[model samples]
Target: NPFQFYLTRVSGVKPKYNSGALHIKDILSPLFGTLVSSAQFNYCFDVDWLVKQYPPEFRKKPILLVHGDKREAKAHLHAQAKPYENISLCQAKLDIAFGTHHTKMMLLLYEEGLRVVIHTSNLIHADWHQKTQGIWLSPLYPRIADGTHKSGESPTHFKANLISYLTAYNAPSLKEWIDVIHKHDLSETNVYLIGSTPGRFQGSQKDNWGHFRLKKLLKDHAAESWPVVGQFSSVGSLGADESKWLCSEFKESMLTLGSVPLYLIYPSVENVRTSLEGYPAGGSLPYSIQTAEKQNWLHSYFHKWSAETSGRSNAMPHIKTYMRPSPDFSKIAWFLVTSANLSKAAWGALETQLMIRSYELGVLFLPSALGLDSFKVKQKFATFPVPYDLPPELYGSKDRPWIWNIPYVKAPDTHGNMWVPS
Candidate 1:
């Protein structure tokens, strides 16, 4: 009963909805990103404790997947699990429906195998729960922690990694873990992706609310670094002579619209190299030494930033560099939208991918108690080598643990602070 009371009063009342689509004008786009970010952070905080308290029986406790839209299910949804589906008919409908029972169903399906009966539609508004049976999280936690921060590269990555931590702990199906796996082919063309690239632009492709929902995730967070790896053919090409043209366009867009920097994390350099290979000015990646030094410098500098300010308040930023070969829901935080070139085909000029944009939200996760300190992120740079490393480890796995596990000594027991764990 206490759980129900807490659920309705504390967690359910706010945000009014969780993940789903909305009509463009019905919701304030930027704020949605903010809300999603906050929800994600809180989810992590609750999940950390959730896993400890309700460790999954894995086999008997079947995995359930809940996504922002049903279309997203195509990539990660499994036929066997019959994952619950959610979609927005018009933007306003989803905007209103997200945080209700559908959302609750999502959580329970993840924590317990409810065989989840789901009926998410763009047609009807969903219902909110009368009680809170599962973990109750505050999506606002991350924003509060990174409160003063504006959307940027690191925060974007932070959101992505944290979301992964949140979603992974909930253990959504491989489909739910969308960006985490290698669904698209990525070998032939030299692809360059940023947080909000034109993606697989959708002109004649029959736009859906899910596509819009994905974009909302992008415009809000406004942050992304290279997260996609391997190779992918243009789901359908722009019929361009060269892929390099498309790559160039995206770089320009990020610089203009998103606050993304002109970063070259190996892939970009490789892209540059491949494009200019036979050109008169081209050479063997001219700035080989410079590239190595700069990359190393960035990580080293961030590490120093973390250590130098380690003694300060929890409000400061800790340098975190995440490198993954493919994308996942968690990695969605650090996006690389690559489907078409930056030409008319990519950004809305040509008939291209209906689903050009991909979305992921960020949030801060604090213990339900809020008494707990924020999770510490370690700096990772030059820790992993590129070009098909066999083991698939995070770069510098050896050095990572030491920095990641920084001690946050528990505070002295407080009056009226603790509650019974579920």
Candidate 2:
């Protein structure tokens, strides 16, 4: 509730594409107000492309933070923009082995105040050009006097959670960044802190983030019985096919209500083939179906994006969301918009000590809390749109769920090969 409002851009209106849509730079420029002291930035996009988006003036002295290998980060910036002498490419302390610095966020220091923004989008051309994306802008928190507060102390739990995330660097390099974050007051914000850091969290009494955090936060809020739906642009490995590893993990954790079913919201080949940008405009497959075992299971769960029927056949989905409908379908039980995809690595598998390998975050919204009806209301709690036209059909026993109205029927591999899971 501390946020002023949500900013959203839907896909498929190609010619101008969400005309007058809010650009990330548009949001940050005004916040800086002509005197930006510095910008602490992080993402998984092309750094050079990102630099180009900034107002020419802010480019003078921007601090970029990255994780994993700085080599790869530099590779992303190679030919996009001429090297700026004022740019500082600072890599954060290396990540937990095998983990990625997947968080998409910005913390800006302005002459007026400090501001933060967490959104889902890569700093790439296609992502902003044709995909649907959403951003949560934090109300600017003014800087406070030094020595008035304890060193490294956060003003609130939300702020503390964020600080802990940055603290994972374990190196002196992040000290200044952390100090700036601590100087601001995050006490007024109303947001659940859901994130993941790489570490073996085996001994922690309760899992604090990712799906575990989702379960804890929704323990009482979940409906007695409701359907859980996930719309992800990317799909990752679920381990072995026979294990049904990913789905099983979801059942044990993400599906707060055991009685309900899990329905995946995936874009069909038809949706991508007919899209305005064809296969490239957020319509192509972002999933890695390398193994036959994984591919076999994906075949059954695939569904059409239904863009044609949704009025914005051109607006392809790039934003990831998980939701549930109230038992009566009058409203939604809860909804989550995040940067995470459908993967054990992103959301964490229980077997892996419930420790995920990506730096991901999302906000949970309860429609009931807003006193709004899901289907009837035009803009009850603002623009968190339910993109699907109808509820997903439940998967069934045998190959039944894998059969019937197979949307990818045109794929030569549809009935071709079946990879047996070990």
Candidate 3:
């Protein structure tokens, strides 16, 4: 539950007032005196709205930009001052055939220290203005005077794991950026990086990246009786039968955690139709169905909107999270915030030649692994939002699952119907 900041969407909310929008400023304001670097899959606006929160003088320092394509440079850089020189775009060239530069992260370097941000939204207006999102704020790692010496880093493996992810880029251009990352002292951090790159990896190589890696990393913390809960915004080609979800890889990877329940947190038709915007407006949101039959089965696991874990609800989720909590609800076993949705391409398929088709990244935090029992332990620590009370629900016959009505028509035929894209 140790989070830097959290946000939930509210009906009829303004970006300036949204917790999703304001938290970025809250994280960067203290380090306003230095340079800011950002990595996003999609970019819009001349400059980041949050970056503009600082004075004009502070904006003079160039922002290091990393994205999937260089052709997008012109459009992405449109927000800069006329005759711009403060924007430095670095296009990742090692992307998998279908993979994109889909990692949403930020590295802020100030005179006093360095900070990293792992979040689930794009650098655009709609992501911040219209949808529910989550951001993981890493405690600022004060600059290390001696980089060669390694005695005081916090999460011992955080640095190595992060560096491994950066090295996967295998792009010459990222060298300088990687070097900048190396200079920071991330020893005091609690996050573990779960990242992906485009390629075919086998055996240990396969086990080192994506969901496979995540499963192995949490092997020790998983309880024999706890259930797994996943929440995502977009659904892809997961197959027609719920029995075949993730091509059965869901259970395969889950083998380490024991055969427990899996529940999905999704918004129902009423949740969106009743939104302040009154329609599914986020462009990144998938409005079409993969297949009606499969979707119906997939829908069986869907649960109504709840923001106790995220803290806000009206905006509609773009965030993705997977969690396993202790049976007693006294604490969480492990929690992950990622850009990946529940699909073969995002999580990888068993029979496919390309295991994982896209480039995605997330941070996994285990309360016990971090050597902390509660967020309350730190003078300042992040906490997970718990909407429902202890003893989480498990779907079954005895426990009639709760369902929300999704509108069957193109537009709302009546007040309760959801907006189904034609």
Candidate 4:
């Protein structure tokens, strides 16, 4: 499948029952082919568990890694990657104020072809355990002949943009990976790469990264006036209120056609309290009280993270997705999955120039790109496999959004846990 959720391994539920869903080990298995050289990027990791997924032979190959932990880096991932004696760390400069290297992805070079995996889960045991995560695996792009090669038919300059995103690191270690990108013909891949690097982009460069890149994409490909839904696990300080930044700069950018409604899908108090991990899981859904209090108006747009159709109603989401779908949910204008949450840092703030922080990479799926007719009202198009149920449930009168920084001790969670400050 081009897009699907990670097959969550529940106790009594047969693993094969989630046949259409994806699994981490399945993506890394040798069935794909012998590994050549690879690069992995993430914000957090559990190398010990990650190592178990790869065969002993594949683990010895050259690996270039990138993460955000700047404090005693050698003590954590470096120490854990010892099994791979050839593993080299790529230090992503985090000098930008209030920024992070939070992009989760993998570039696997196989003997037969190259496969790109853009996902939302970190390399940790708990992350892969029961949480709802996403994965988009590109087709095995074949290597170009020594003579000449051109990008395949999958629209939107995917290979070139990928190379550009990799080159943005400016790390000598990634130069090899960049060189390898040119050796492959990625025309068979169907999607758009909307990536963000830390910087203040201007003019033509402005439309190439961050939310501005998305804005450009929406202006050109997506339909206007449809309901645009943003579902994510975290929420950054979206200005003192929604009107200033969210409604103006951010919302205006997405309102390409005309008057479009926006919906924010997050977990409600009961939604989190009754979850698998219960209150403990809320630890990762870090929407601070300081930020939530300021965005009081956001509660109106808030919706529950209920995905009964995908069988992940209580898995406790950690994935992020954006899409514009019909009122009946039978047609989707477009869909986007990325590491970028609802943060100015991730999408950048519009000003004299677009100022963005953090290294984010996501794949944009459009009807035209995926071999479907362009967006139209009476088109009767096949719906995309949206992870969540559409026409989301609005917050109830007694319900409130989950604020991680605040305490929730009125009642015990399913795990008999109370979320007090850790």
The number of the candidate with the highest TM-score is 4
Model 3 lDDT tens row, 1-422: 34554653443554443544444445456444455544333323335564564445555665666766545555546445345476666666644455566677877777766777888877665676656777777776766677367533555377777777778777675677678777777877766778766677776677667777777776744445656677777667677676675526765564455146666776655555555455544234453442434456666676656543333445577788877765555556667888777766677665434377666788877666556554321111145554333343333433322122223455552244454443
RMSD of each: 21.5, 6.2, 5.2, 2.8
Winner on lDDT (1 vs 4):
4
Identify the leading candidate in terms of lDDT: 4
What tens digits encode model 1's per-residue C-alpha lDDT throughout 1-422?
11110111112222432222122111212332221100111111122222222222322232233333333433332332233122111110122221211122122222111111111111111111211111212121121123344332232243333233333223324334333212211121111112212234354323222223223433443334433321111111223332333234433333321223222222121122122111111121122332233233322211111111112111111111122222221222222222221123223322234332322221212112122222122221011111122222232322211111122123211221211212
- Model 2: CA > 4 A from native: 1-20, 31-43, 70-82, 92-98, 145-156, 220-223, 241-244, 282-284, 292-295, 307-311, 366-384, 387-422
Per-residue error for 110 in candidate 2, Å, reads 1.5
Candidates in order, TM-scores: namely 0.23, 0.78, 0.80, 0.93
Per residue, candidate 4 scores C-alpha lDDT tens digits across 224-276 of: 45677888888888876777788888877765531578899999989999987
User: Would you give me the overall lDDT of model 3?
Assistant: 0.60
Candidate lDDT scores, in order, read: 0.23, 0.59, 0.60, 0.79
Q: Which stretches of candidate 4 lie over 4 Å from their true place?
A: 1-17, 73-75, 149-154, 257-259, 374-382
Candidates, ranked, TM-score: 4, 3, 2, 1
Worst 10 residues of 3 by lDDT: 398-407
User: For model 2, how does the per-residue alpha-carbon lDDT over 8-87 read when each residue is reduced to its tens digit?
Assistant: 45544543434535676776575446546554444555667676677777777555554344575565653333466655
Instruction: Give the clash count for each candidate.
Output: 37, 3, 19, 1
lDDT, candidate 1, equals 0.23
